[PDB]
Design an enzyme around this catalytic site. Structure first.
Site, PDB file in Angstrom:
ATOM      1  N   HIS A 279      -2.553  -0.935   2.407  1.00  0.00           N
ATOM      2  CA  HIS A 279      -2.238  -2.191   1.729  1.00  0.00           C
ATOM      3  C   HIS A 279      -2.539  -2.124   0.228  1.00  0.00           C
ATOM      4  O   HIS A 279      -1.986  -2.907  -0.583  1.00  0.00           O
ATOM      5  CB  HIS A 279      -2.900  -3.389   2.414  1.00  0.00           C
TER       6      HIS A 279
ATOM      7  N   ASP B  59      -3.732   0.757   8.687  1.00  0.00           N
ATOM      8  CA  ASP B  59      -4.009   0.475   7.274  1.00  0.00           C
ATOM      9  C   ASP B  59      -4.676   1.686   6.644  1.00  0.00           C
ATOM     10  O   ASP B  59      -5.907   1.723   6.367  1.00  0.00           O
ATOM     11  CB  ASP B  59      -4.795  -0.827   7.088  1.00  0.00           C
TER      12      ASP B  59
ATOM     13  N   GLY C  42     -11.239  -5.976  -3.452  1.00  0.00           N
ATOM     14  CA  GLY C  42     -11.510  -4.880  -4.362  1.00  0.00           C
ATOM     15  C   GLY C  42     -12.312  -3.760  -3.718  1.00  0.00           C
ATOM     16  O   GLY C  42     -12.402  -2.660  -4.285  1.00  0.00           O
TER      17      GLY C  42
ATOM     18  N   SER D 193     -11.399  -2.922  -0.551  1.00  0.00           N
ATOM     19  CA  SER D 193     -10.374  -2.316   0.298  1.00  0.00           C
ATOM     20  C   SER D 193     -10.097  -0.873  -0.048  1.00  0.00           C
ATOM     21  O   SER D 193     -10.069  -0.507  -1.232  1.00  0.00           O
ATOM     22  CB  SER D 193      -9.067  -3.069   0.153  1.00  0.00           C
ATOM     23  N   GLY D 194      -9.877  -0.061   0.983  1.00  0.00           N
ATOM     24  CA  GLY D 194      -9.573   1.356   0.800  1.00  0.00           C
ATOM     25  C   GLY D 194     -10.771   2.256   0.705  1.00  0.00           C
ATOM     26  O   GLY D 194     -10.651   3.479   0.902  1.00  0.00           O
TER      27      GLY D 194
END
Ligand SMILES: [Xe]
Length: 240
Positions: A45, A93, A186, A188-189
């Site tokens: 995402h 994801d 922020g 995320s990942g």
């Protein structure tokens, strides 16, 4: 990260900042994990938008010179082929970023260790989330890399009705949910690092939190379960 503490400079050397070009500058948007000298693992995402991306390794403070940073362009983006941007709850994801150059390793820049395929953590396993994400719900990004202690919540509990219900899949890891500490926008990942047999490994890629807020009791932060994707990861790196 809500309810975090500042990470020591050399604790999490596989953490990267994924940034996009914004006018004459660069803006942090997501975390990632360095997994080869020229590959980063992040959330699908994070790269849905048609933006220009770079990775920063050896990053500690987004807004000050650390003396340790290396800045590298993203050459290729491989999203999981089953990812659907309108259905984060379906899973998948995850994305791999091939870097334009191979970064140099040192005490601030190291590859993240990934779990063996299929590994599932016992309930309440010790883990840390790291990132520069918001420090409060609807707040602002951190300047310095933050960490928070977020124990896992197993699938049985996490998919129960007062937690996430059907929204959580067995291809995910839940962690935290205490109402005080959490991932936030922020983050995320980025990695969820969990201590197993004396060694930290990256068991999660930060994926989502509640629409109601970041630190919500019984809404633990949800991560893509890295150990579900080992073959996919290896396949992409070997064909690219
Ligand atoms: Xe998040």
């Amino acid at each position: 990260v809500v309810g975090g503490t500042e990470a020591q400079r050399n604790s999490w050397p596989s953490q990267i900042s994924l940034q996009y070009r914004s006018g004459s500058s660069w803006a942090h948007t997501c975390g990632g994990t360095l997994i080869r000298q020229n590959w980063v693992m992040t959330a699908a995402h994070c790269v849905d938008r048609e933006l220009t991306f770079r990775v920063v390794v050896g990053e500690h403070n987004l807004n000050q010179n650390d003396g340790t940073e290396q800045y590298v362009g993203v050459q290729k983006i491989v999203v999981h082929p089953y990812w659907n941007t309108d259905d984060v709850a379906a899973g998948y994801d995850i994305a791999l970023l091939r870097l334009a150059q191979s970064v140099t390793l040192n005490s601030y820049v190291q590859l993240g260790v990934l779990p063996r395929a299929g590994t599932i953590l016992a309930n309440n396993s010790p883990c840390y989330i790291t990132g520069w994400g918001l420090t409060r719900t609807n707040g602002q990004l951190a300047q310095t890399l933050q960490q928070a202690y977020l124990p896992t919540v197993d699938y049985a509990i996490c998919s129960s009705s007062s937690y996430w219900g059907s929204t959580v899949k067995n291809s995910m890891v839940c962690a935290g949910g205490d109402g005080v500490r959490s991932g936030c926008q922020g983050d995320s990942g980025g990695p969820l690092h969990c201590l197993v047999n004396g060694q930290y490994a990256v068991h999660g890629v930060t994926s989502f939190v509640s629409r109601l807020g970041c630190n919500v009791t019984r809404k633990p932060t949800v991560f893509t379960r890295v150990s579900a994707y080992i073959s996919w990861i290896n396949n992409v790196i070997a064909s690219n």
